[PDB]
Amino acid sequence: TQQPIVTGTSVISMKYDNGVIIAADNLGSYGSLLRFNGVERLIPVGDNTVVGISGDISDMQHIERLLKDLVTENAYDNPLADAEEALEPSYIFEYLATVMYQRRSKMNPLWNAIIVAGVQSNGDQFLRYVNLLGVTYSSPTLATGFGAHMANPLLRKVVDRESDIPKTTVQVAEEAIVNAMRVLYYRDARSSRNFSLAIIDKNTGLTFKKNLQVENMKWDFAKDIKGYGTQKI
Amino acid sequence: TTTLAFKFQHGVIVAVDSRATAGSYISSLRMNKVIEINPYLLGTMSGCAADCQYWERLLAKECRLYYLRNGERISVSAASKLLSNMMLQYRGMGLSMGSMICGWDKKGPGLYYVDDNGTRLSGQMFSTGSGNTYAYGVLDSNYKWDLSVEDALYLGKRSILAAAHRDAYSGGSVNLYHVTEDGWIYHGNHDVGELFWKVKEEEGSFNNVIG
């Protein structure tokens, strides 16, 4: 049993017609202190999977190392390590899910919420969630922390059920994700303007975008707001 | 729950209710609270349902192995003691079990009360569960050694009915058993709803209740 110290906030994601998108901000908070501003919380595994992690950063760095070691171990005595016997998103997720549930069962959890986004060998989209309790679920949209409360409602307006996935393009999906990240910046006190975004497409592969910023923000209406009720000046 | 068991001239009667509760919610209307360890051994269940089922079924394994090793049926005294020693291994770990081990052996009919503390008592008459007080009232005033099989079966049945009526956590149906030297004999499942109205009319009891 522990308590999280340095933490990362929401990770948000969604499926679209040819793949998946995942995003997360670059902040490492120390309680209310916005301590670290250059933290990458999306971690690619090969060219077909991106693991997005929220929660305790020391535990994230530990998981990051397990995944790096997983790639190394899979290549051992494996001539098809960069082909048929390469790591799949489903393999990577189930490994993490196994670890998370074992750790909670020893009453010593990895204090995280993880989303594994990727594309399988057969082109199928993979998107599944796992957390410190070992709880797993899948959905056309997935989000952690505040993202679950604010991002999912916006993303579910684009992909409300399974049949909406083929009708959703990458431009529309990315637009929805970027808008959601702006909304979180407005309303999440533990968020930052700077974020990273990753797209895993079955045709164009893995596109990893760094140093993105929330833009087109509305603040002008603030000038007119005065007092808390009766004050006019 | 309410359970009872008593020795008499023609063996031992065993009667239990069938209710199961999860708080104030009645989770089960008909649960089997007797276990048939062997043709001559019975076990009642009160407390945690899982604990009762697991450990008494494990007792049956151990009583069965006794027969294979010794070519002979285990005594009620020895069977009850094996169970009490199991309870003593998980001492203070939070098991909740109250059972009566009923049977017939070379000493005649045998009846032993056993609980999670490891308590093991020999006796003529026992009753366990939330409604045992109501059952004891009927048993104590109507029990004799000189009871007939027919009257004894009714006493245990009527004693459960008494508890099922008053105790909120007892009811559903009554399961009856009669243990002889030729083995135990099941005497059926009796719905309390139907049994109550029947007894009220025939016996004249429960006058305060309207029907």
């Binding site: - | 209710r19 509760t21 104030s24 919610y25 009645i26 209307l29 939330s130 099922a164 009526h165 008053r166 105790d167 909120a168 956590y169 007892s170 009811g171 559903g172 719905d191 309390v192 709803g193 109550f196 109205w197 429960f206 305060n208 209740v209 309207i210 029907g211």
Partner: protein, 204 residues
């Protein structure tokens, strides 16, 4: 310990076609112990019916209180109180004890003598009104009653059909609750006749 579940009990009310029904169990207990099988939880002030579940002392106390208030209402107004008006009186009376409340779940049922419109309503212990068209439930088997009412109920039922629906809703909910049962009563209410039926049920 929980005052709302010491004595046990349930009340349910339904609307029908030009009629209403309200029913209750008869049990009163001290937790596991059954004490009385004649503790009726439904009262009437003129043509307005009130069912109350929860702590028995408060049930008794509130009946005596609403009898007090409706009798004065009648002397001054020179007419019997109506269900809509009584509902507001109950809500008002409960909220005046906001920080030391009666541990009850009241249910109002009746027909407006002028409009002829059937009316039911429920409250929380603090006075929040639930003016439902279909049905109202209260008591230790409220979850059970919600399931039964929601599946068995259909609108515009005739009195003799409504009777069967509400009775089965109560009976089967009570049979899945340890703290409810020991008898049951059903009131069938029409604009100028009221029938009261005691049901036969299992006594465990």
């Amino acid at each position: 310990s929980d005052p709302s579940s010491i004595n046990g009990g349930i009340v349910v009310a339904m609307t029908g076609k030009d009629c209403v029904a309200i029913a209750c169990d008869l049990r009163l207990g001290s937790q596991s112990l059954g004490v009385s099988n004649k503790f009726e939880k439904i009262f009437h002030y003129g043509h307005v019916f009130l069912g109350i579940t929860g702590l028995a002392t408060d049930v008794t106390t509130l009946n005596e209180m609403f009898r007090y208030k409706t009798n004065l209402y009648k002397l001054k107004e020179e007419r019997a109180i109506e269900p809509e008006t009584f509902t507001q009186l109950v809500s008002s009376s409960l909220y005046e004890r906001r920080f030391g409340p009666y541990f009850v779940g009241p249910v109002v049922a009746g027909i407006n003598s002028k409009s002829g419109k059937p009316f039911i309503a429920g409250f929380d212990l603090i006075g929040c009104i639930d003016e439902a068209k279909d049905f109202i439930v209260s008591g230790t088997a409220s979850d059970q009653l919600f399931g039964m009412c929601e599946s068995l109920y259909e609108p515009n039922l005739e009195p003799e059909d409504l009777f069967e629906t509400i009775s089965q809703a109560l009976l089967n909910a009570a049979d899945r609750d340890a703290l409810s049962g020991w008898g049951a009563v059903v009131y069938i209410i029409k604009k100028d006749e009221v029938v009261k039926r005691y049901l036969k049920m299992r006594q465990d």
